[PDB]
Amino acid sequence: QQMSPDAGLELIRTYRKEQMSPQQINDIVHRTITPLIEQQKIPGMAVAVIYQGKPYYFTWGYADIAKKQPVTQQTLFELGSVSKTFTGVLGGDAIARGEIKLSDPATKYWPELTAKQWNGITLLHLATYTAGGLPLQVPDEVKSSSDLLRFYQNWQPAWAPGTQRLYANSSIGLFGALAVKPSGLSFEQAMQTRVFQPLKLNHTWINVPPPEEKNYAWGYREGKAVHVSPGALDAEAYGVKSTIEDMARWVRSNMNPRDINDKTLQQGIQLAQSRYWQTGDMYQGLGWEMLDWPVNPDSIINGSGNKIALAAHPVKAITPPTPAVRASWVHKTGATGGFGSYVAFIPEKELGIVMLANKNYPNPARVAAAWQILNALQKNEDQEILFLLSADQVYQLLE
Amino acid sequence: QIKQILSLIEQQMSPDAGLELIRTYRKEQMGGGSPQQINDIVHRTITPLIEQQKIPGMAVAVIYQGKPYYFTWGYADIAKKQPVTQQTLFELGSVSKTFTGVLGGDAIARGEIKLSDPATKYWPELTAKQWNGITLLHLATYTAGGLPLQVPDEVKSSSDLLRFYQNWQPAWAPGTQRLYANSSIGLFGALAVKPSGLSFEQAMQTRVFQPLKLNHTWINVPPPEEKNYAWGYREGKAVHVSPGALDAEAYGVKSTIEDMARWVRSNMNPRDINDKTLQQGIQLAQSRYWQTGDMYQGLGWEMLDWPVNPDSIINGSGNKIALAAHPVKAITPPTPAVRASWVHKTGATGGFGSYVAFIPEKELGIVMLANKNYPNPARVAAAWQILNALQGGGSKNEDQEILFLLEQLKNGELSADQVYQLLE
Amino acid sequence: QIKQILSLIEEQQMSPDAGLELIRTYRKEQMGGGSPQQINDIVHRTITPLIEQQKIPGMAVAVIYQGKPYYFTWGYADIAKKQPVTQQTLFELGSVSKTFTGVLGGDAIARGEIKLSDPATKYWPELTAKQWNGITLLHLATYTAGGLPLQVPDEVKSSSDLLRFYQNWQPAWAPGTQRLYANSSIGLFGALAVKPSGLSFEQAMQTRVFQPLKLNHTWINVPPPEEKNYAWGYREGKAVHVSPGALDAEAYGVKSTIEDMARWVRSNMNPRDINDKTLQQGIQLAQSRYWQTGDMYQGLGWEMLDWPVNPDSIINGSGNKIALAAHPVKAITPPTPAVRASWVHKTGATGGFGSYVAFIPEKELGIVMLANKNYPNPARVAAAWQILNALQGGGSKNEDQEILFLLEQLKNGELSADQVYQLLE
């Protein structure tokens, strides 16, 4: 209608979505996840779908196989690396609280850290895996604070900071450990009072209280029931346990920060999705990873595979950090020895999905299934409409 | 009341805190920021500056608690016996860059550019190998690798300019040294307006000047305004800034003391601006991108942590230091505009000397326009004297040693009564 | 049409003079007209070659047609500053200031403060020399005192220095016999005419001429907030301003804008619209005819010729060879009241400014030419004559006398309507 093409593209997408609380949600969730459960031999799965700001939960399988215990909406799964999204957000909170700057060097908060190669390494580098070759894991022998200080003072980098991005638990682990030092609280207390309790995530635990071990599900690796074994900085990197309800609340909160009474935590949620680095079509936030939406499905699917996600890539400093783009695919994979988790959402379209499973199955399957689900819920061939914006030529070129 | 400050000086009084408070209580004790005290300190500082530096004419604006106070001396045109007035136009010189920076900032807030974009993105014909890793941020912050202080006077065409930049040999890698230069930020300003389709003068007019009602600020003085365009004076001769390549972006703005007071006010409190991308633009222009000594580089503006070491800004304004190369550490990501800052910029032409400096949290500011190019340390020293006196304190030795007395009351030792007896 | 005019003249209903004037406007509008376009055309076509020929940096011209002003600007008030001449630019009027001085004197007469027939020594008793016995204010105002010098000497720098200057002066002629243009004469007249008021000349001029006429940008001393409009004068390429001198305010020291000067010319054309009664009578007295020299009449500052004029006479007579020479005067006793059918004008100059003012009151026509270079008088008077004549119809004294003969016979008999029509066409 002689229209401004800008609104024409997106609004056309929304009408195409109006074509099809759609119980279709139940349909596509079943048609996508059931072949995934059967195909991957997944003992139990909890899946939450956020549609129009409202959660719809779906539970399959056993939380405890030998005990015939079913996965309920109160089952606790090991979030694994998804924990980082919390850490990041907590870090963001500190930034909003005026306690830290990402541009600050790490040693400003660990004074006892004095090795020469730690002079140009900043909290941003630790939070974004861009410190220059921190190992993917803290060594098992690290069991004390002086053991940890000994590990980092004797770490020798591969690269100069800000040049390379290597996914590592020690990087954002130390980031989380440092971001709370100006608070006075420990990491557990800080996360509990500044993130969990303000969002009323009342069954999300860094340490499962024994009165709650009944809901702690078993993870299954090679048929044996496993739980994540303790480690150093585990709370910052991979040691959060939550229920599908609390995780659905987590996605709701990371899509609509303007609904949170906490102002500092709101700005922190916004800062965790800021675009600090670029690699390919992926932007690195604080814990979260972002892409532009619409997105290339084979790119996020093949990019989720550990063959790529663990490989070091060079980064482009985005100055200033691009504020939280709503036309984004915000996601994070998680996994422990026995669990497999995935969180992905598109904030502009108010859409989200959480997928918790007590078996660690490959990330490409999770990103693939989530892409099929959220995809059918509403392409680059479509964006040819922006170039196509006469009336009969459009209606006929579509029909 | 002062006894309550002393008794508070416990963890109920910080490093600064009581220094600041005793400063404003000393302000209350002397005058108290009277519209008379302003005139008094401004005269006792600027008058000897004028007589010593042999400054033909001068205008000074003092922003105190967000209110402008204008002051005029001397002659805009010596021969014509024309006095400096509040409608007199001065050549801002390098202070023009504060506009360019802000304009650049606005472009960022519009999503038309990113400081991390490469220079070659907006000028593809810039094909030399040395331009490969150079970004708009490098150009805006004098960190491209050693661009020259001036664009040569003989650069007078587009091809002359292209050849100028192609033939430039960097002395350093991008992002490692700060060397102040008109070619750097000038090129930045010229590039930042290309996605808007406007000329630099038109973008500046419609995006900065007009939203701020800067109705007597010009890149090109229109003919009916030439009567207010003051003469610059270099060695007794009347002079005006000649046209040059990229002058509009680097040193070609002309303004009045009123418009300059409104500029400083707008950069102190962008929250009163209807234009949103201009407000964010100011915010980005006062962001801290690099650090050198105790100095942070914004977009045109330069910022120090407040309170500031007077000897550092005064000595650092001299051209032996201000124009030298210095190493930079990147502030990545850039810190947003810190209100506890001393934000300033010097400017000059052949025959004009100007300075602008403000402290945003204290709502304090000063503009100094003069039609002679006199040394920077004199300008920054006078400005520090005025702003220091007006904010409460006096003498750097008195500030350090009074901070010492308060630290003594903190570490027991001095204890309320003896501190007070020493102070009164 | 002309037919209506000739028939009306046959019917006694019109004077041959009114026939002459109306016919003048008719053939004026036959091809050109009194449209604001004819003004623009003749002004451009006259002043542009004047500026290009005389190498004039900047200029302002006001043309008053039927009491309305039309302004024109060229060039630069400040060359170096690239500052254009505008309607707020201040020029140095030079000797045109005398027209103000005269009018002020007239106002003084209308106030009953002075008499032109009083001796000068009455208002300056300390002037005790013998040669001052028969010299009156009229003599000083009209350059007929007996040979006062063109200039007051530069070494005259105090009131007593001035007294010594006038006491030791040697007259070459008896009062009332020769006209010698001189700043000392009318300058002394202006200084004396304000003495009974107790005001200074600057104060009397400000409150009694400038302020009643709303001449709000006319100055004897340019105040500091106005120096930005005070144009530079240019003499041999250098910028110059008129230096202070004895009696400068009375003789050549006024600065004005093209607007204020347009109001000055209108005020002298139609004083009948001025609330200030004594200023109105003062203007009228300043255009009275006190002496005759050739075809020229001397007023108070203003000089008058009968309109229409022989152009070569005003052009040639404006040159300094004649204008500064001594010429004998015939006394017009008593002075003729201000003749509206006159060419009333005055030239003025300083080192770096050249100005000219000329108006015809009966035709409500006028021109002001202010320029920041001192170029010869005949060029100014020629330009003004071309413009005003063109705007008035075509003129010429011989022509008007011929048409007046045909119209006189029209009122008598001899010709009759269709005759005069045929002879005119």
UniProtKB/TrEMBL annotation, chain A:
- UniProt cross-references to Pfam families, sorted A to Z: Beta-lactamase (PF00144)
Origin species, per record, is: Escherichia coli
Q: Which family does it belong to?
A: Belongs to the class-C beta-lactamase family.
Protein's gene: ampC
Domain Beta-lactamase-related: residue ranges = 30-377
Q: Which GO terms describe its molecular function?
A: beta-lactamase activity
Q: Which GO terms describe its biological process?
A: antibiotic catabolic process; response to antibiotic
Q: NCBIfam families in the record, alphabetically?
A: bla_class_C, BlaEC, CMY2-MIR-ACT-EC
Looking up Gene3D superfamilies in the UniProt record yields:
DD-peptidase/beta-lactamase superfamily
Alphabetically ordered keywords of this record = Antibiotic resistance, Hydrolase, Signal
Catalytic activity of the protein: a beta-lactam + H2O = a substituted beta-amino acid
Its Gene Ontology cellular component terms are:
outer membrane-bounded periplasmic space
Q: What is this protein called?
A: Beta-lactamase
UniProt enzyme class: hydrolase
Q: Where on the tree of life does the source sit, at the highest rank?
A: Bacteria
Q: What is its EC number?
A: 3.5.2.6
InterPro entries registered for this protein in UniProt: AmpC, AmpC-like, AmpC_escherichia-type, Beta-lactam-related, Beta-lactam/transpept-like, Beta-lactam_class-C_AS
